[PDB]
Amino acid sequence: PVQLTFYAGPNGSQFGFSLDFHKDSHGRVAIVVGAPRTLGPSQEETGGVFLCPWRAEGGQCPSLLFDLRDETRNVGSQTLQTFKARQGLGASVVSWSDVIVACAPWQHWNVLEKTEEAEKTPVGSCFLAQPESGRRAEYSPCRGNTLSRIYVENDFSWDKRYCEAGFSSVVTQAGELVLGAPGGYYFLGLLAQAPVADIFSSYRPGILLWHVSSQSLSFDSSNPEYFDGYWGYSVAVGEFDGDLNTTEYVVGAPTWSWTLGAVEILDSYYQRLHRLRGEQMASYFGHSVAVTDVNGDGRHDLLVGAPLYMESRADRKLAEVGRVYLFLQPRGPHALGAPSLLLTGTQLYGRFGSAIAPLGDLDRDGYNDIAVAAPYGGPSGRGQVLVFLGQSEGLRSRPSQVLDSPFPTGSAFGFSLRGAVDIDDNGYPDLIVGAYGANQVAVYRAQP
Amino acid sequence: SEARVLEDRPLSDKQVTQVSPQRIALRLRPDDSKNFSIQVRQVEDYPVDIYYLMDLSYSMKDDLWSIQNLGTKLATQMRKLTSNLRIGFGAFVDKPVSPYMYISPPEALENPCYDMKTTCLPMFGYKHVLTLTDQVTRFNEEVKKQSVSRNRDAPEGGFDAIMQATVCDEKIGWRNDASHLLVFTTDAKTHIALDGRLAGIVQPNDGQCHVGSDNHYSASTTMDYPSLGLMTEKLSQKNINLIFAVTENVVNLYQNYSELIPGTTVGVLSMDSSNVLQLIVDAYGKIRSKVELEVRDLPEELSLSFNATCLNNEVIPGLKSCMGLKIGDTVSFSIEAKVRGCPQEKEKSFTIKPVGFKDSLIVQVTFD
């Protein structure tokens, strides 16, 4: 347990708020960690996508050169302004071959045209880093010359202004990036899918507004049962229709149907294949989702977090610990039903189930094993990361290993973690944990 | 050894004669033992502290007047329910940060109702307004003065407001020797823990007070909303009973919420507040007191013992106080005093004070 590898960041930076792994075409694996409050050369906290190379000692990372200057571009009697002031350039990072997609959910964006404007709303924006080619492209499927008045007049139909695009993001196996913007459609949420190759090809310097032909934005809805659900607060990709020719999108909305929270499974064409609803109100059922074959039968199963779940115990006490809902995909063309298994934390006020990290398989055998977060768990109340050794039947209620925060109080250790990626190529996934409050990231190289 | 009764004013049933008799002369001979029975009854009403939390969002606008009534009417009822009352209140909108507010054009930071060409106050996390006081008039005036602000999304940060309403005392002005009630208003869904991550806030709300001088929740923009668990911890630890007074639109949401918090209740905040005031008087029906006695100004030489007879009419030796007395119940205590010889002082005076009762049995003792 000695090799609790520490990666440091500057004060204020929130180094560790979001994290991911990158493997350039050269083959060098780097921890991409977003510090959404990194001090730029303009003494302003905007965000920093620290491309931390794998160093045993870690420390300060070389801030990958992302264009931090605000573009005041002029086109068609309009001014595209990309307010990067407090943009959080680093609140979500993903990678695909030699491409790093590093998204500022708070990259406010505006169009000055006469008196009217697009309103500097946190539309988000993924910087496309090709460091090997040095290509600094930009992508914002949510970026839109549509005026505020136009969005208001249509009952906020397709109201994408508040996307926080790149609030979450995944890359499809075929190579198309899906970004989940919970703020989409006026905080309803959406998914926007476009190939990385196509957006790179369509990129031109100082344009910041261009339709991508192959983009796939989600269909909005008008049923109040979806309102304020943050339909996209958590996003993942799995096959649930038993059709390998199409890729299925699993969306966790933790406030679905008046704080109940749900997770929906849709086809590639953004149509509901099923919906799975929350048991306990205000438990945030959909804060973190995770698609994987916990059963390991070849049909993807769903894992949902509920970090504000409160259980009933002796003397009739409701103790707020959290919960993990496991839904198992039935054999053949059968729809998912009742929560297959239910997992619960111990420590009070721990926010158990804030972040779920698909661990794949721990013991390199075949039972899919995952991990879950509890940022204020443990006897002290500092942090907790709980390894759920999954079973061929499902998920055991007693977490195998618990990682406690070595940081002081306020660090929110475990709040954003990721596994399923082998850093040292030992044959096992390495669990990287983003204690943002201490501006550090802890990498644990889990030996089974 | 004769015990002459001097002051024997009868117990009131609401002078607030809470102890009868009031004054006794006890005459003793050397080596003497003697038992007399006192009786005690609660007369004056019970102490209570009400804190009131209100929405101020564009949204809240539909029912703003409604929540204002839920303040004043409530006070009036508990004026007719007890005399020992204090009332205080606070307001809230949401976390003051994008995307919850409008930041463009810059005037939006001073008025986010730019697009409607109207004026709304710069939206705020939690602005504690009135410290708890017996001056109910000032509470009413300050409650009516509150007005609407604006944010972007439908859910609002009420849980932050409740946590900062209960989490500090000196700012809010509670009393240790009283019951505590917390009435919370809203008309839409509530921002709960983990909602603020849309605005970059990922540090939780802890069990500490972050209001200082300015009467604002200083750490609002850097502390997330609070979860139901820490809400329950702070309500119970401080002995605060919660009443969600919410609009009938999604009253089921808050009925489920109240099922989620042990001991809290939910009223339909509406044209009337019967469903909330009846639950106020319900919670007032469950307050149980204790009658416990101590003896002051007595030397060690004189030995004492006692029995006790409570409202259950079961006699117990060595138990000086039963648990869970009510208004009007009478409890008797037969105290046995044994003297060892005649001291030089020849005339003593001491007190028997029921704990929390300003009235006391003043006993004058002479030895022959």
């Binding site: 006026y186 905080f187 309803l188 | 949204s59 944010n151 439908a154 839409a188």
Partner: peptide, 7 residues
């Protein structure tokens, strides 16, 4: 409401 608006 969808936003901070009257239903």
């Amino acid at each position: 409401x969808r936003g901070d608006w009257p239903c």
